[PDB]
């Protein structure tokens, strides 16, 4: 038993070592630059040989790192979240060699950039922002649930009013949800209301629709959508305190 701790001591002093982290960051960053340049048909070819080489080098190194992590014990590697994230990315990348309907750019490029966040974590003036976001996420889930549960009721009422009248926005539940999400974002619902206004001759339901939009925008845009602010401040003060 005496020996392998030193080998474990070696594994720690390598994997946690900062030169290694800096190299891996440099590789992933260069790969992201290659992805950005491949987003150009001309340069897609001229250096295709270089981009493909870098593409494979970074993947092999990622697999090596997952192997080192597993070398320390399957369970502790899986007693984390960042490790399972990196594993999911490298595994989805790996199956492209075998399967054929996954080795496509819409599934392989952006994952190599989601691989970059755990790299950026080592830059703790950055990491605290991510930690705040993650910690505050459940409160945002509760606020999201509030807003959706509010939106569904008004969607029902709006459909059962402006159905069979302006059916470009108010036929079924889904179209109404999308319309109310336009409104709660407060950009482009004036164009929507012009559809109420755009008629041959009408006065009774322009006022009703205006009342509807005004009440939704007051209670849900000025109060509900100004609650993410407050949740973030809540949690981030909690961290600053504890």
């Amino acid at each position: 038993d005496v020996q392998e701790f030193i080998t474990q001591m070696y594994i720690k002093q390598l994997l946690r070592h900062p030169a290694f982290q800096l190299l891996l960051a440099f590789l992933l960053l260069s790969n992201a630059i290659t992805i950005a340049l491949r987003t150009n048909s001309y340069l897609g070819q001229k250096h295709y040989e270089l981009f493909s080489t870098i593409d494979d080098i970074v993947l092999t190194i990622l697999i090596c790192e997952v192997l080192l992590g597993w070398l320390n014990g399957f369970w502790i590697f899986w007693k984390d979240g960042w490790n399972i994230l990196n594993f999911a990315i490298v595994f989805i990348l790996f199956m492209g060699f075998f399967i054929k309907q996954l080795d496509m750019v819409a599934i392989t490029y952006p994952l190599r950039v989601l691989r970059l966040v755990h790299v950026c974590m080592a830059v703790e003036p950055l990491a605290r922002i991510i930690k705040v976001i993650l910690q505050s996420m459940p409160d945002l889930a509760n606020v999201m649930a509030l807003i959706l549960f509010f939106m569904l009721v008004f969607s029902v009422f709006g459909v059962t009013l402006f159905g069979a009248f302006v059916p470009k926005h108010f036929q079924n539940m889904g179209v109404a949800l999308y319309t109310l999400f336009i409104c709660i974002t407060q950009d482009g619902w004036l164009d929507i209301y012009t559809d109420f206004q755009m008629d041959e001759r009408e006065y009774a339901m322009e006022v009703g629709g205006a009342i509807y939009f005004a009440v939704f925008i007051t209670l849900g845009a000025f109060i509900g959508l100004n609650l993410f602010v407050v949740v973030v401040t809540t949690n981030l003060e909690q961290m600053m305190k504890t």
């Binding site: 070696y10 080489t53 494979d56 080098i57 993947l59």
Partner: protein, 32 residues
């Protein structure tokens, strides 16, 4: 031809991994 990018990929990794292995042994002689 195919066996010339997967091969370069494995080439660099092992070529790197040897230098990593160098330090592990080299450190043992230093402590001793």
């Amino acid at each position: 031809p195919f066996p010339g990018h997967a091969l370069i990929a494995v080439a660099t990794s092992v070529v790197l991994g040897v230098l990593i292995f160098i330090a592990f042994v080299f450190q043992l002689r230093n402590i001793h």
